Design a binder for these strands. Structure first.
Ligand SMILES: [Mg+2]
Ligand SMILES: [Mg+2]
Ligand SMILES: [Mg+2]
Ligand SMILES: [Mg+2]
Lengths: 159, 44, 104, 130, 49, 99
RNA sequence: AAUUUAAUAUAACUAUUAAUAGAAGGUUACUAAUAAAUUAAUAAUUAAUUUUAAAACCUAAAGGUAAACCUUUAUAUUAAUAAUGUUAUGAAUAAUUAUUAAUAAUAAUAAACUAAGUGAACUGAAACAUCU
């Protein structure tokens, strides 16, 4: 059988398991360690769930690529360069940092809801909003219309 | 006479639980029905 | 009117035609999986239309199909598992013997 | 002569290094009687039928869901030229989980909300409040 | 050097013992590593844990 | 040459890009030995997020009625069947165990 | 500016004296990670107190077994709602998606010391049974 009869496409999804259609990245092609740094927990806190979801799978995809290269190197060549292993570990650090941020965020939301569930604390927070920023001397004319629109959306379920 | 084999018996001292206290890992499935006997059941 | 196997074929054809899953999506949603799969070079007994992976040990055949389609867009029609053994090994004769890891 | 480079007996085994050793190692799948079944935690879906089959319960099968729209720009790493941001919760005993911090954050969202934080505006800031 | 070990963690107890050698007996292993390496990647300084 | 060197505090250095101590000669602390200038950096790798949008904030705490994380995503965030998470007692339980 | 001597370390056991107190292992993997606050001193920085996240499977007693395995849809059940499809035949109704209230469970947890029950024989008596 001859491969000249084939039409293996250039957009074939398995190509995502390789870096720029290369068998195994060399030292120069691999991103240097100096130029790089894993995300920081505060940085992830400024990210929406969709964006964090997107980052997670992007991390996983390169993790698969690096895993493929480590295995090829450590199962054929046998070298202990472990440059790919270190890169994967750095990605692994970011992955759990993402997981920590999500848990802390979810816990914070639950804590706030429970705190606002007490009548005394809810009344204090509401009246503080009412007296201070609401019931102004007409400084905001239509801005208060926006203020309320975000008020109903946040505290209550009115959109 | 003195009741040596009944007095020498000892049982575990369960802690006092408040409503704001940690839940024990393992608890009986049925409500207690009798006051605990001071000397417990004879083990001999 | 039709056999079960014919219906399975129709469902897969329908999924491909409509640009949707060619399988049935389960209800247990994993939002942040941590599983990694290693592409493997073809063997002699393979054809240019197949691909072999080193999947996690706790990985169903259905799991890989969903894993490939949803993360990579690759659609796997037939998936088949080969679970290997672990030979006993010892770095020296003085140490305890333990089996090499099983690789799925 | 199994090994042509060993003409005389030197104690070498037919295969392997030692014929003896520990046998108390945990069982695996490939070894045991034909009725043994170890398992690989890879099937907790469905119910064995009375005849000896299986029925997939599709509410237990596991599916990996990816976002409909994927942000391609978020690379796994981060450029080294942006410093590692740090967060300070000065005056907030409970830290990021502290309810009163959440109340303040929604307060800011009310009055002048949907505004990029100090850390987001500039890529040269070293700490940020909150 | 195909071992499939990097993909799993088998023999945790044995690996820990080998990697946590008593500090009194490090000179036993230091001689082993020194005698079994070429001269052009060996330094005359003791290692650090 | 400098006989011995000591440090008397810490500070953030925008050049080394991280917190570094002050490197002062042992004895006189006024004479301060500056840290060397780091070499220029040029990040061109496609696997590095651009600074201008890596830090761009996208999420705001703007709700107490909607969970920011969908319910089906909680299991991935944390283990629901965790043996380390023990509950608290109630009046009913105490009456159940107190003879 | 360099060397020796004696003592001092995360890096030994044993004995006596003094003081204080009554605490995880293993298997391999989709590896089993943290975040902060207050006070005390040179914008930062250590120390003390307080809070906080994750933590797979087995270690008799959710069930079972041939330990690290299988069955238990708590991503669950009931109820309500908005929509879809949708039967039924506007309304109903469940199925689904998504919210809210109620309904639930995780035993490896030491050794020595103390007290209580039962309780030998070798041996000594230069034998042996009372006795030991
Ligand atoms: Mg098979
Ligand atoms: Mg056999
Ligand atoms: Mg059986
Ligand atoms: Mg005698």
């Amino acid at each position: 059988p001859t491969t000249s009869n084939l039409r293996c496409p250039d957009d074939h999804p398995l190509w995502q398991f390789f870096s720029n259609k290369k068998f195994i990245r060399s030292a120069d092609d691999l991103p240097p360690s100096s130029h790089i740094r894993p995300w920081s927990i505060p940085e992830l806190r400024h990210k929406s769930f969709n964006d964090l979801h997107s980052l997670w799978y992007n991390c996983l995809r390169e993790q698969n690529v690096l895993a493929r290269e480590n295995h090829l190197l450590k199962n054929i060549v046998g070298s202990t360069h472990d440059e790919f292993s270190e890169l994967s570990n750095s990605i692994r650090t970011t992955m759990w940092q993402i997981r920590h941020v999500l848990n802390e965020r979810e816990l914070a939301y639950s804590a706030s809801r429970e705190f606002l569930q007490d009548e005394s604390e809810r009344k204090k927070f509401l009246d503080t909003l009412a007296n201070d920023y609401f019931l102004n001397k007409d400084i905001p004319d239509d801005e208060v219309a926006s203020m309320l629109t975000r008020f109903q959306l946040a505290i209550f379920g009115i959109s | 006479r003195q009741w040596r084999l009944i007095e020498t018996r000892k049982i575990a001292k369960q802690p006092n639980y408040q409503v704001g206290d940690a839940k024990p890992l393992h608890m009986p499935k049925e409500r207690k029905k009798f006051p605990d006997y001071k000397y417990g059941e004879s083990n001999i | 009117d039709i056999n079960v196997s014919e219906k399975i074929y129709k469902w897969t054809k329908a999924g491909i035609e409509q640009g949707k899953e060619h399988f049935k999506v389960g209800g247990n949603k994993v939002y942040f999986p941590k599983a990694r799969i290693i592409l493997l070079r073809p063997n002699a007994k393979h054809t240019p239309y197949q691909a072999k992976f080193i999947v996690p040990k706790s990985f169903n055949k259905l799991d890989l199909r969903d894993y490939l389609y949803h993360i990579y867009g690759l659609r796997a029609m037939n998936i088949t598992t080969q679970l290997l053994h672990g030979k006993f090994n010892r770095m020296n004769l003085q140490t305890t013997r333990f089996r090499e890891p099983q690789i799925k | 002569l199994t090994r042509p480079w060993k003409k005389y007996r030197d104690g070498e085994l037919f295969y392997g290094l030692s014929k003896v050793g520990n046998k108390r190692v945990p069982l695996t799948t490939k070894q045991g009687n034909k009725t043994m079944y170890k398992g690989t935690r890879a099937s907790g879906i469905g119910r064995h039928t009375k005849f000896g089959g299986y029925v997939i319960n599709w509410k237990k099968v596991r599916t990996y869901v990816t976002p409909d729209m994927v942000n391609f720009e978020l690379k796994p790493y981060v450029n080294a030229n942006v410093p590692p941001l740090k967060h300070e919760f000065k005056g907030f005993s409970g830290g990021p989980l502290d309810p009163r911090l959440q109340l303040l954050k929604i307060k800011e969202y009310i009055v002048n909300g949907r505004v990029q934080s100090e850390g987001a505006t500039d890529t040269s800031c070293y700490k940020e409040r909150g | 050097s195909g071992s499939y070990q990097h993909l799993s963690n088998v023999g945790s107890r044995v690996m820990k013992r080998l990697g946590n050698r008593p500090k009194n007996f490090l000179p036993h292993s230091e001689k082993f590593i020194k005698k079994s390496t070429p001269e052009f990647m060996k330094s005359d300084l003791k290692e650090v844990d | 040459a400098v006989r011995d060197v000591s440090f008397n505090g810490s500070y953030y250095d925008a050049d080394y890009k991280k917190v570094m101590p002050y490197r002062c000669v042992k004895g006189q602390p006024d004479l301060i030995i500056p840290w060397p200038k780091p070499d220029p950096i040029d990040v061109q790798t496609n696997l590095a997020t651009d600074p201008v949008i890596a830090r761009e904030q996208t999420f705001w705490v703007d709700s107490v009625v909607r969970n920011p994380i969908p319910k089906k995503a909680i299991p991935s965030i944390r283990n629901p069947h965790s043996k380390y998470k023990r509950g608290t007692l109630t009046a009913k339980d105490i009456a159940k165990l107190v003879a």
